[PDB]
Amino acid sequence: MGRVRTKTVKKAARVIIEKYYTRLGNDFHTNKRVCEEIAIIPSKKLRNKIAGYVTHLMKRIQRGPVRG
Amino acid sequence: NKGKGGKNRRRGKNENESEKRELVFKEDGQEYAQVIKMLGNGRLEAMCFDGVKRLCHIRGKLRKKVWINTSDIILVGLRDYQDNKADVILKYNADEARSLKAYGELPEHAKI
Amino acid sequence: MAVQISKKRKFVADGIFKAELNEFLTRELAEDGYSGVEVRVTPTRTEIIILATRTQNVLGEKGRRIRELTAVVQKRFGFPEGSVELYAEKVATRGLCAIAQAESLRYKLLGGLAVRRACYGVLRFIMESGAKGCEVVVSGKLRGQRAKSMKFVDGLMIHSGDPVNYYVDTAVRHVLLRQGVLGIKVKIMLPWDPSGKIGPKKPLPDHVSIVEPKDEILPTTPISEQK
RNA sequence: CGAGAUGGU
RNA sequence: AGGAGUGGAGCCUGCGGCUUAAUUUGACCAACACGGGAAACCUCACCCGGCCCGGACACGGACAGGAUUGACAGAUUGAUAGCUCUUUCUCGAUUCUGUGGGUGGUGGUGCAUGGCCGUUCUUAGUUGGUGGAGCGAUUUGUCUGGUUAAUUCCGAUAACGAACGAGACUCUGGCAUGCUAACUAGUUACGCGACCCCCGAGCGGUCGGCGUCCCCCAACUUCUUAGAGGGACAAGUGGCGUUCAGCCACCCGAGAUUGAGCAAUAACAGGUCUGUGAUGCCCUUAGAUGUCGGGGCUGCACGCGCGCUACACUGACUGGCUCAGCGUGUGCCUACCCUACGCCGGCAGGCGCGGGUAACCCGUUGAACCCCAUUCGUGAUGGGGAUCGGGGAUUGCAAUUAUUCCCCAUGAACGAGGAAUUCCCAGUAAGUGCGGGUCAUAAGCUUGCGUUGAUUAAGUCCCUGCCCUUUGUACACACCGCCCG
């Protein structure tokens, strides 16, 4: 199968959260709309993967520190 | 075309013993001979058809290419000194050896 | 044409015409620095636009070669008298065109210059002209009776996926020396250019970029402001 | 813990 | 674990050997239905014969009572080649002749080369700069562990910061009663109009049934076409995880692995000079290795490879009924296309007369297996259809060594195949037919499309191989190595 996320996804998600933490939340369908206006992303299929890992990171940041 | 040994070693250029194999006869200083025994070290015992037996040697050009054998028919070069010794120049196929005898070039002694 | 030909045959024949015209111009204008042809149609008239680095050689002393080329293009392809016009145009940014660099390396080798001195001569000029990277290759009987090849490379260079169809420019050429033929291959990788025609307007598929946050005030207190 | 030698291009 | 086989039979087709005037030739997992290689002539390179210059240009000679060109008739010849011999007209500076020099060649070398293609190799692999370690070749970065389809991520850390491959990317399949809008696409409805049936509450009707029967100056976009956007993220819930990176089940949903293209560094004495006005050197060049006539590439004691048809009743034969999708079409030198409808003939086929340069005409592309009814009866049989006799059409300049097609007759081996051995995991295997290429004439090949539709697995390293690490070596031409009496 394999669902592991490549460094192009994981680095873009971290840089979005460092700059726009106050805009983001737990709803994937709202995060998917925010990430489309704060960044230039070449593909719809890449935009969905970035908003997915951003949604995973927000639910971690609500519990404690993330080292990056 | 068809290999007739079997190995990894496709690293050479193919033998092509074919087409314009134009038939070769004697000049001065040469004889036809039949191989009697093969020795070690790249040398052999041969009889020519006028009856002088000699010890004979494979020229450096024929090494690991034109495989000689017992009872085979060959072209041999004589020395102007050391008459007991000589060197191989060519091998004739059984198809060429019968053409030499058909041109009357060989006495009725050679086996084919 | 007493009854018109079908659209399948029409679209194939129009492509076969552009291929033969490009071959004729390639071998007529090789030393004169040719790099491409463009053709356009208007009522009763066809205009052919031709790109080169030294346009005065395409014209000749008073336009002789434009008149000679107009005559043979009309004579060979069967246009009626006066319906054909040829315009020469100068190549912009000639360091970022792979065909002009493959031809100038061919004439530099054919004049007897040494292979490494020639190849680093074009490799410098392509990278000074503003490419993101390049790859130059020469192969054949370089120094001795057994064949060899040389690679010269600088900067970035992609090989796989669809972006290769618009980020990489390429040419292949032959040169004949007294011992036989040598091959030349040239590849150049273009810069992204949002508008300006140095390179493509479309970005690379994995180059995400984030807009910067600006000018917020952290403190607030409640106020009202009427117009 | 069956038997398993050898090498023109 | 299993399915369909292949190896056994007849025939087709590629290869070796033999035979011959010639049976032209390349290639030996990664050669053998491969050279897009289905050769009547041509193609054509091989074999037997005969004409021709299409030998630029330079220098010298010969030459306007003339350099040279062409030909009737008879003989000759495969021949109506004035090729050659006898004869005697004709043309007009264009040729002829000697020397130098060119030009052409499916001639030779792929072990002299370019370009292209295949393969190592379908796996996860590869490399600088500055810093650290060694006299040095070299090394670290590029890793103990966990995780992934992945040198994919997490993390660790004398290394830090980067480049290519992977992935992203492009095409394709499955969803939208929401958008845009159609006389080269349809539906519904009616002003209605027309044929047929009474089976229907009820008449032969307003009203019912059937329609590729016909107008709309009716309404519209569900079904067809095709442009723009939308949608899926391991996103939600429960377990397991150094609680990270991830992994398993389930809800909701058209959908929780659709299938292809493109692809790195370094190599190989891999294939191709017979794809080329890509090309070095060598050979040949007027009694030619540069055009016509005939023959061969098909020859048959024999060994091998890819395939087609079958051994029957889960069948064969004779009637009846009812369903596709992808494409091609008047040839631009080059001279040919796809076909409805009517008439003649058992059939192959023939004559007449229309449409189509194509969502418009062949065409609602009336496809095969399958489906329903009949006959045969376990018999080498009404299974199987090789081999061979006689007659009739069509292509073509020409069909004999049978081009292809049609008809009556003849009726072989073969009863599920020894040792071995190939391919395959879902709309897949196998069954079944139809387009494209090549084509004057013509698929038992190949490249695509639809239709009927399973059994067995969800794993392992045993056999054959690939990736990474530790280890040993007398190997580096690298185990198909090296070496002793």
Q: How far apart are CA B35 and CA B66, in angstroms?
A: 14
Cα C195 from chain centre: 18
Query: Residue B7, CB, less than 7 Å from strand E?
Result: yes
Least Cα separation, residue C217 to chain A (angstroms):
14
Q: Hunting for tokens 């194939």 — which residue is that?
A: C12
Domains of chain A, residue spans: 7-62
Q: How far apart are CA C84 and CA C70, in angstroms?
A: 7
Q: How far apart are CA B72 and CA C3, in angstroms?
A: 79
Tokens of B46: 């041969």
Residue C211 CB neighbour total at 10 angstroms: 11
Helix, strand or coil for residue C20? helix
First to last CA, chain A: 28
CA distances from B95 to B73, B91, B98 (A): 11, 11, 6
Contact A46 C212 (CB under 8 A): no
Helix, strand or coil for residue B1? coil
Contact B45, B37 (CB under 8 A): yes
Chains near B with 3+ CB pairs less than 8 A apart are none
Q: How far apart are CA B12 and CA C75, in angstroms?
A: 55
> What does the angle CA B59 – CA B62 – CA B68 come to, to the nearest 5 degrees?
100
Q: How far apart are CA C211 and CA A12, in angstroms?
A: 12
Resolution to 1 decimal place, in Å: 2.9
C208 class by beta-carbon count within 10 Å (0-12 exposed, 13-18 middle, 19+ buried): buried
Tokens of B17: 């013993």
Contact C134, C189 (CB under 8 A): yes
Q: Hunting for tokens 């434009």 — which residue is that?
A: C66
A14 touching C (Cβ < 8 Å): no
DSSP state of C94: G
Listed in sequence order, the residues at least 6 apart from C133 whose beta carbon sits closer than 8 Å to its beta carbon are C127, C153, C154, C155, C156, C157, C188, C189
Q: Is C170 left (phi over 0), alpha (psi -120 to 50) or beta?
A: beta
Contact C106, C121 (CB under 8 A): no
Q: Which of B43, B52, B47 is nearest to B87 (CA)?
A: B43
Assigned CATH for C7-90: 3.30.300.20
Least Cα separation, residue A61 to chain C (angstroms):
21
DSSP state of C14: H
Tokens of C80: 């009626």
Residue C83 CB neighbour total at 10 angstroms: 12
Residue C65 CB neighbour total at 10 angstroms: 19
Listed in sequence order, the residues at least 6 apart from C89 whose beta carbon sits closer than 8 Å to its beta carbon are C49, C50, C51, C52, C55
Contact A39 C210 (CB under 8 A): yes
Contact B94, B34 (CB under 8 A): no
Assigned CATH for A7-62: 1.10.60.20
Of A19, A20, A40, the CB nearest to C208: A40
Q: Which of C194, C220, C198, C219 is nearest to C207 (CA)?
A: C194
Strands B30-38 and B73-78: antiparallel
E-strand ranges in C91-179 read 133-140, 148-155, 168-177
Q: How far apart are CA C182 and CA C105, in angstroms?
A: 12
Q: Is chain A adjacent to chain C, meaning 3+ CB pairs within 8 angstroms?
A: yes
Q: How far apart are CA A51 and CA A19, in angstroms?
A: 15
CB under 8 A, 24+ apart: contacts of A44-53? A46/A8, A46/A9, A46/C205, A46/C206, A46/C208, A49/A5, A49/A9, A50/A9, A50/A12, A50/A13, A50/A16, A50/C208, A52/A28, A53/A5, A53/A9, A53/A10, A53/A13
Strands C84-90 and C45-52: parallel
Bridge partners of B33, per DSSP, are B48, B74
Tokens of B49: 């058809």
Query: Residue C182, CB, less than 7 Å from strand E?
Result: yes
Q: In chain C, which residue's Cα lies nearest the Cα of A23?
A: C213
Q: How far apart are CA B23 and CA B100, in angstroms?
A: 9
Q: Method of determination?
A: cryo-EM
Listed in sequence order, the residues at least 6 apart from A66 whose beta carbon sits closer than 8 Å to its beta carbon are A57, A60
Q: How far apart are CA C159 and CA C165, in angstroms?
A: 10
Sequence positions preceding breaks in chain A, C–N over 2.5 Å: none
Helix H segments across A21-67? 28-34, 44-61
Q: In degrees to the nearest 10, what's the CA dihedral of B100, B102, B104, B106?
A: 40
Contact B65, B58 (CB under 8 A): no
